[PDB]
Amino acid sequence: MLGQMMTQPLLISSLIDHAARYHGQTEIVSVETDGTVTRTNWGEIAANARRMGSALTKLGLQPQDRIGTLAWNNRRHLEIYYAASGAGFVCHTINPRLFPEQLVYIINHAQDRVLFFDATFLPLVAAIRDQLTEVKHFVLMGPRNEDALQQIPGLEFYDELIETGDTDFEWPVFDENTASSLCYTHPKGVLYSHRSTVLHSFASNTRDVIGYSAMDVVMPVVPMFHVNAWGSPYGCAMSGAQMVLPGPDLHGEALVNLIDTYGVTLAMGVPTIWQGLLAHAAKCGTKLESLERTVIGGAACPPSMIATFREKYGVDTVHAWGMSEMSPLGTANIPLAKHRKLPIEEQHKLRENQGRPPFGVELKIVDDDGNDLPHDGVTQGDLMVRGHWVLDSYFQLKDQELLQDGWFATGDVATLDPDGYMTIRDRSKDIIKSGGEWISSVELENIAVAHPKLATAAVIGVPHPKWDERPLLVAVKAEGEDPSEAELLEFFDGKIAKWQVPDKVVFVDALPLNATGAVLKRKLRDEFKDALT
Amino acid sequence: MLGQMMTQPLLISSLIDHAARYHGQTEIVSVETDGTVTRTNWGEIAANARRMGSALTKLGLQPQDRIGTLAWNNRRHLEIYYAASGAGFVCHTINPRLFPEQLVYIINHAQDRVLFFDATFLPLVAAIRDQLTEVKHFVLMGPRNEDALQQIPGLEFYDELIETGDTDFEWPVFDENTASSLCYTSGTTGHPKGVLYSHRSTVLHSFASNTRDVIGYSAMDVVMPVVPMFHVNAWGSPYGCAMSGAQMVLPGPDLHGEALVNLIDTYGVTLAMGVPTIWQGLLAHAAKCGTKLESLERTVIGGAACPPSMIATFREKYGVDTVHAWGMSEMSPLGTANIPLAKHRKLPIEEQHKLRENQGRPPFGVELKIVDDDGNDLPHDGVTQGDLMVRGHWVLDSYFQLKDQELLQDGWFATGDVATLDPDGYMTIRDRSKDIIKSGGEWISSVELENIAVAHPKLATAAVIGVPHPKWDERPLLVAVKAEGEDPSEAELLEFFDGKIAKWQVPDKVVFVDALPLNATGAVLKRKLRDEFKDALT
Numbered sequence A: 001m002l003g004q005m006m007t008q009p010l011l012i013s014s015l016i017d018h019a020a021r022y023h024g025q026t027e028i029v030s031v032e033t034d035g036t037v038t039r040t041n042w043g044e045i046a047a048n049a050r051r052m053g054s055a056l057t058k059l060g061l062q063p064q065d066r067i068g069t070l071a072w073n074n075r076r077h078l079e080i081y082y083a084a085s086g087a088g089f090v091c092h093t094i095n096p097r098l099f100p101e102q103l104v105y106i107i108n109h110a111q112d113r114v115l116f117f118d119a120t121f122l123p124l125v126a127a128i129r130d131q132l133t134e135v136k137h138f139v140l141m142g143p144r145n146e147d148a149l150q151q152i153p154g155l156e157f158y159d160e161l162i163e164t165g166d167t168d169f170e171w172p173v174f175d176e177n178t179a180s181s182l183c184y185t186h187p188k189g190v191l192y193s194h195r196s197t198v199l200h201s202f203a204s205n206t207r208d209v210i211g212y213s214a215m216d217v218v219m220p221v222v223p224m225f226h227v228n229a230w231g232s233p234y235g236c237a238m239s240g241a242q243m244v245l246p247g248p249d250l251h252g253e254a255l256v257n258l259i260d261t262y263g264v265t266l267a268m269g270v271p272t273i274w275q276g277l278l279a280h281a282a283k284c285g286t287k288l289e290s291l292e293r294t295v296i297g298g299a300a301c302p303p304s305m306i307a308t309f310r311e312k313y314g315v316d317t318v319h320a321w322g323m324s325e326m327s328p329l330g331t332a333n334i335p336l337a338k339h340r341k342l343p344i345e346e347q348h349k350l351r352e353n354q355g356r357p358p359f360g361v362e363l364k365i366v367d368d369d370g371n372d373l374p375h376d377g378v379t380q381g382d383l384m385v386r387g388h389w390v391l392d393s394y395f396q397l398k399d400q401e402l403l404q405d406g407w408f409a410t411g412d413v414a415t416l417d418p419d420g421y422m423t424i425r426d427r428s429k430d431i432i433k434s435g436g437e438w439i440s441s442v443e444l445e446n447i448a449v450a451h452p453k454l455a456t457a458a459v460i461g462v463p464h465p466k467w468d469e470r471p472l473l474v475a476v477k478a479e480g481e482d483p484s485e486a487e488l489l490e491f492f493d494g495k496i497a498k499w500q501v502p503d504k505v506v507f508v509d510a511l512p513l514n515a516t517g518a519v520l521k522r523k524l525r526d527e528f529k530d531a532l533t
Numbered sequence B: 001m002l003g004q005m006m007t008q009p010l011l012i013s014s015l016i017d018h019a020a021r022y023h024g025q026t027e028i029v030s031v032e033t034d035g036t037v038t039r040t041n042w043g044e045i046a047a048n049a050r051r052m053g054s055a056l057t058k059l060g061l062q063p064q065d066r067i068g069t070l071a072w073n074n075r076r077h078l079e080i081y082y083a084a085s086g087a088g089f090v091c092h093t094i095n096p097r098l099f100p101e102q103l104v105y106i107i108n109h110a111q112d113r114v115l116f117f118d119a120t121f122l123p124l125v126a127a128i129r130d131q132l133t134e135v136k137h138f139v140l141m142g143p144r145n146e147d148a149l150q151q152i153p154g155l156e157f158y159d160e161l162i163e164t165g166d167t168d169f170e171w172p173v174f175d176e177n178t179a180s181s182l183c184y185t186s187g188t189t190g191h192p193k194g195v196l197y198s199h200r201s202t203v204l205h206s207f208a209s210n211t212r213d214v215i216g217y218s219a220m221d222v223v224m225p226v227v228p229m230f231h232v233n234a235w236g237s238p239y240g241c242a243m244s245g246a247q248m249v250l251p252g253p254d255l256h257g258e259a260l261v262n263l264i265d266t267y268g269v270t271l272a273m274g275v276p277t278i279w280q281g282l283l284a285h286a287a288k289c290g291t292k293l294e295s296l297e298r299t300v301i302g303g304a305a306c307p308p309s310m311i312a313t314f315r316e317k318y319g320v321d322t323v324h325a326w327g328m329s330e331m332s333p334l335g336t337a338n339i340p341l342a343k344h345r346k347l348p349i350e351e352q353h354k355l356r357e358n359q360g361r362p363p364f365g366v367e368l369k370i371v372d373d374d375g376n377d378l379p380h381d382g383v384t385q386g387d388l389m390v391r392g393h394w395v396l397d398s399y400f401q402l403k404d405q406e407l408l409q410d411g412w413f414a415t416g417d418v419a420t421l422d423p424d425g426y427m428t429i430r431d432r433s434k435d436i437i438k439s440g441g442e443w444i445s446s447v448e449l450e451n452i453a454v455a456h457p458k459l460a461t462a463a464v465i466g467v468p469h470p471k472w473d474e475r476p477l478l479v480a481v482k483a484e485g486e487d488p489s490e491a492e493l494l495e496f497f498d499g500k501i502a503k504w505q506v507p508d509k510v511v512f513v514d515a516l517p518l519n520a521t522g523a524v525l526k527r528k529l530r531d532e533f534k535d536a537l538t
């Protein structure tokens, strides 16, 4: 027996419709590539999103055709977010800082039919254009420009295209599991749905995760070009938050000036960009008066950075962790009631880890055989996740058997405590599990390659009858040199604990490579099965 | 082309499973009928709920059979919420303040197969038991009691039945649109009707309730729902608090003001929720004893219009923020919540306060509009009033055992409330259309008049109703309860209206009573007051 409630699909277009209906005049600020500042609002963004969705539809594209972007955080990237998905196409955010052959691989693999790009990337797109055989439309996110058209015949222009859209366009309806958007980690594509997008927004919009309010002025410096700017374009629409979109000017002085000029209350960024922001802030003496809180994810937030925001500015720092495969958010560091009964300096220390998971995601750690390990906060194992916005399989790789008993392995080794707080410790593929302590193979490689007589080297875990696993140095002699095993091993002395030094050295002509370039440490392990027995 | 994400149903059992995994030791305080207090936590509630779901499945119940309850807010009621819905049955909370004859109708219409009930209602259940012929199991929410077994032969006992449950029971997996729970709502006209929620609608409502500008239950909070778990599932809080791992104080049978003040001060409540009448006795007792209610941060006040003077007392005297909220049994309940917008910060302080007085604005997932008598759209200009319509992910489509009818108008549900809507989406209740007063050819808000009167320091509370008059059809009558030490005159009460409302709308007469009649959910029984005073002006 079914309930008797109204049932509507969870569609991304409903998010932008709500913001225009109940927060239409709420301000959005957009830093453009030409140095102007657009002052728009949820209502104009919605009408342009509808118009561009009609315009895209009139090009004859098929449902769920991919629409690529190479774009900063600005109003036109935000209109594309909702135009593409709302009209039934797939919004494919591309990282414009990748190498040219990486972009050619990604754009051709996703089969983008349209490529929107900001003017910063004109020369990059013009350079790779010849290799983009499946793109039917290149669209500069600005007005007609005679120089640009010279660089890319026959470029089209956003500000003309959008005028082809009907003013009365209606969003189509479809299954909420319809593919909505795409993001690549050879890089692998994660294909989101409307359902997963909206549930992730819901979760991220709860008070104890991030939680956007109508009273906030939110500045996402995390890029809309990768993992959905942590869901902020969607969460801010559900709540009618004001937004400051920083465009291409991300150096400390510009970001500080945004915060003080528009009164940013909530800022979202990664550690390296914040280091620049805090540097300019210390110099000019600003109090960052409106700032209340900051979300820092994508790389481990440094404890001293948290302390600076707290002690200098009275700003709470939310360390958050995630990945393209989790839409991205998996965990966020927000305290529990009992923590207030601890000494204050221990309360501070509790904020350093990657955080606790919200409803809709589940975490666990497993041993090398895949069996559960205790969540005691000290035992380490391979981190596994599942939930409403965790992927099931990678794009165009459905036949590939990714999940392990319904769980996605993240690649990290981690600890989990009884409350679910997660600490990233290492990467599963990098660990050599020797008896008394685990060894990082990349740390030993970095020592080995610095030797004047080695072209390159690899370090692999190999079996040992007494220690389980021990490191073996697979070295390639540098041109014209004959170093001995003895001296190469002696080069580690004083650079690492002596019990971590590889047990033996083997020489080879070259290392087994991937078309990707990197080493296939798998055949190394097979070929040197009995090196230490 | 579909996405390639994990696709799981949204389940009520996922809420308790998340609380148990990641908030297992977070404490829940439970005031019991036996006169003691239980200190428990989400982990225990969850393990008990698992065992009870197993025990109920072992009885042979079929999927979506109705499980009935007649119970206070306490740990066993919370365990039942998750035990029944998690196991795939319909959790049917029943209001024990209804007449015995109404309970017979409701329980037989819903065909409950199990009736859980608290000890307070043992005589009630025993008096009507022979008319509950489809209930197969009567379960005292307690341990074996011989006296009770005498009153109800074949009575069973919650603390024995739970021991029949398997320790390793796994919740069934099923479509998220499966029916989950059932609440009956009456008034006018005729027999009460059933609202049949789903797991999907419940989880979606929970997400929305947990955003910052609605309620937003936090792991730091100590939540006390005075609203009953049989009144639209205590406004969702048992689901929203599980999602967030909030601490809870569950008040049991004692809901008078002195009991509530003591709960807040003893267990450090930070967020409390109930209808206006519940807060009158709380504020009254608190003023007498001198407490500062130090731990209290916020309240959620809804179910009837919150008096503007109640908001200002919480703000001025305790530094407590009142969130005025509106909703319905048919809306799971939440419709609107009053939290500011960014542009309100720059207004003068007194106009900021005034904007907190209306019923609030809607979160994502629900939509509001007003229509005229012919059913066509009216402007959302904040002045034009009309019939309020709603729709969304947690709005009813049709009533239980009544899916035949064309209830909706153009896909919208008619609330029965008369309201204005402003361009920012703030809703203001004018009246229930069954209560609105028509005098001399123009409508009068009884809600507006009575909450003007409530503000006078010499009245503890008041209500306004329409009564016949030979010239004007209806005229407003003020029914007033004098404050504890006070003796206001009739004339000084009607003068308090001067310049707050048009002169022709001021009540013509004041009658005093020692208490207002209240219905089974703490709101004023204005129909009884209209019958009792039908002649006050003739």
Ligand SMILES: Nc1ncnc2c1ncn2[C@@H]1O[C@H](COP(=O)(O)O)[C@@H](O)[C@H]1O
Residues within 6 Å of the ligand: B185, B232, B301, B302, B303, B304, B305, B306, B324, B325, B326, B327, B328, B329, B330, B359, B415, B416, B417, B429, B432, B521
């Ligand atoms: N904040 C409020 N102000 C005025 N009336 C309210 C408010 N909240 C709920 N109501 C009334 O309560 C009705 C729902 O009643 P019930 O289903 O019994 O809880 C609504 O349709 C309104 O008439």
